[PDB]
Design a protein around this ligand. Structure first.
Ligand SMILES: [Zn+2]
Ligand SMILES: [Zn+2]
Ligand SMILES: [Zn+2]
Length: 597
């Protein structure tokens, strides 16, 4: 009843699961054998483990065990009448006589035994058959979940502030990178028990081993308080990543209108398609149409129950903005997870229920029907989210907004090789193979200065611009030195901004971005500027911004990282590189060394 199920691979009823595999998949008699015989996975589960029942034995390898009446024995402890649990390309279990088997085992083995530390592992997880994607997605996430248990605890050494801390890390264990992708639960001890105190994110500070912190319950901290990286249980998947597509000749689901604010006249042509299809992809480019577009489908389809989602709390909220304008605040909810990451977002009280517009993160989603579902920044999503979305909302249609030339989901575990955009999730693969459905562009926040920079052979092709070159070009080609925190510093690279364009008067209200963390710091030391990194630079509008590369290391020179640094400006940009072959695509004017003071 817990022990019987569909083969993950051929679908045949079975009473065998793999126990080596963390997600304990069901495997029928044939696929189980194809799986165990050539991998290191030798533990098979039924209602009991396939192991030697002889007291004192430690044989667990299904390929050396025999059926002993109704238990299992090694060669040694085997009864005289007894046959092997492996025989003739099958493991013993129920429904031998029925089971279909599969030519999908090469990937299933590969997915089940890899370790997720290699770009390769993620390509298999997106190029595989749809069912295996659910298997991989799950496998990957439970793997990231349990890997958190490898890291040290942090203890509060000193409460400097409202905002700052001193942590001591537990000795002998690695300490996790400090950033918003890592979320610790806080703890305090009485003199008799241990009591939770909220969740916390941490960031490096300027001077000293001082760290910034945000928290969920404003409870003021002690010395002795401590933080653990909490590993959560991972639920099984079920819905596909993408449903299978349906093309229509009419407009199904709900009833469009003839009363669109005439500002949306230009998007009528795409709202077209959302009627014609089961799901539709929309690229994309920053600034923006995307934030606007998502709204014009409500007005175009004024009776449509619509559910708006993303992974990021930020983006889900940013879409109540641009949506409490155009849309009636009354008939629309907007809801909350287990704990607000920092300070979040809610609606009317006493609750139950929801209808017309719901705004929610993939995690906090409920079981609901919609007519349309909008998934906001899918380039940030993973096939685990895709599955979950699809499994919690029965939609008639799915629009997926995003642009694959911007930033991807963090892969904790991924420390070797690099992901191309196509391998982010199921949808990004489409947008980078059969092209994005309905492109848009339009660019209403950036000067054609850089609009047609990123247009060139730098991941976009044909984008165009509204504003014109009302800015200033830039180029530079010497290479400073580095002091390789673990992150590297290039202060002689920032040394050439210091006293050459400083000459510019009121045009001094600028932001500083740069690739890494430690050369991101030396902006509050010398020069003095309000600095924000690339990972912060999303949706927020800026004027004067400057850019300092490094050695390359194409992690600084990742072309998607770089697109979402330069598209974050209105007035003026200037760039100082390393290059030596990168200027063949950035279209500006070169400048030199002895004319900068
Ligand atoms: Zn099978
Ligand atoms: Zn296995
Ligand atoms: Zn034995």
């Amino acid at each position: 009843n817990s022990a019987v199920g569909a083969c993950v691979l051929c679908n045949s009823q079975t009473s065998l699961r793999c126990g080596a595999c963390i997600r304990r998949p069901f495997l029928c008699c044939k696929c189980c054998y194809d799986h165990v015989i050539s991998t290191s996975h030798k533990l098979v589960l039924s209602v009991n483990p396939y192991v030697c029942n002889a007291p004192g034995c430690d044989v667990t390898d299904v390929t050396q065990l025999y059926l002993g009446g109704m238990s299992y024995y090694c060669k040694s402890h085997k009864p005289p009448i007894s046959f092997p649990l492996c025989a003739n390309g099958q493991v013993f279990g129920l429904y031998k006589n029925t089971c279909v088997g599969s030519d999908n085992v090469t990937d299933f083995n590969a997915i089940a035994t890899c370790d997720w530390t290699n770009a390769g592992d993620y390509i298999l997880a997106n190029t595989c058959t749809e069912r295996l994607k659910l298997f991989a997605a799950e496998t990957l996430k439970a793997t990231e979940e349990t890997f958190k248990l490898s890291y040290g605890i942090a203890t509060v050494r000193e409460v400097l502030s409202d905002r700052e801390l001193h942590l001591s890390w537990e000795v002998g264990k690695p300490r996790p990178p400090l950033n918003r992708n890592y979320v610790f639960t806080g703890y305090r001890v009485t003199k008799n028990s241990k009591v939770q105190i909220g969740e916390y994110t941490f960031e490096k500070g300027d001077y000293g081993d001082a760290v910034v912190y945000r928290g969920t319950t404003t409870y003021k901290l002690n010395v002795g308080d401590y933080f653990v990286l909490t590993s959560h249980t991972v639920m099984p998947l079920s819905a596909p990543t993408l449903v299978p597509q349906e093309h229509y000749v009419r407009i199904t689901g709900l009833y469009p209108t003839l009363n669109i604010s005439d500002e949306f006249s230009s998007n009528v042509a795409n709202y077209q398609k959302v009627g014609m299809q089961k799901y539709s992809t929309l690229q994309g480019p920053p600034g923006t149409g995307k934030s606007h577009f998502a709204i014009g489908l409500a007005l175009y389809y004024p009776s449509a129950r619509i559910v708006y989602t993303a992974c990021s709390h930020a983006a889900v909220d940013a879409l109540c903005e641009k949506a409490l304008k155009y849309l009636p605040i009354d008939k629309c909810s907007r809801i909350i997870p287990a704990r607000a990451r920092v300070e979040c977002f809610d609606k009317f009280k006493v609750n139950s229920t929801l209808e017309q517009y719901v705004f929610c993160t993939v995690n906090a989603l409920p079981e609901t029907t919609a007519d349309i579902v909008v998934f906001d920044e899918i380039s940030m999503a993973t096939n685990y989210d895709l599955s979950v979305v699809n499994a919690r909302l029965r939609a008639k249609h799915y629009v997926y907004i995003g642009d694959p030339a911007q930033l991807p989901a963090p892969r904790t575990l991924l420390t070797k090789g690099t992901l191309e955009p196509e391998y982010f999730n199921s949808v990004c693969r489409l947008m980078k193979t059969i092209g994005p459905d309905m492109f848009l562009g339009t660019c209403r926040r950036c000067p054609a200065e850089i609009v047609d920079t990123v247009s060139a052979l730098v991941y976009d092709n044909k984008l165009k611009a509204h504003k014109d070159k009302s800015a200033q070009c830039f180029k530079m080609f010497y290479k400073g030195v580095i002091t390789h925190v673990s992150s590297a510093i290039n202060r002689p690279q920032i040394g050439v901004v210091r006293e050459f364009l400083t000459r510019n008067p009121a045009w001094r209200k600028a932001v500083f971005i740069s690739p890494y963390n430690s050369q991101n710091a030396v902006a509050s030391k010398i020069l003095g500027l309000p600095t924000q990194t690339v990972d912060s630079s999303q949706g927020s509008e800026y004027d004067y911004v400057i850019f300092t590369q490094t050695t390359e290391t194409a992690h600084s020179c990742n072309v998607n990282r770089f697109n979402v640094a330069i598209t974050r400006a209105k007035i003026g940009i200037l760039c100082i590189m390393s290059d030596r072959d990168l200027y063949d695509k950035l279209q500006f004017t070169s400048l030199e060394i002895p004319r900068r003071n």
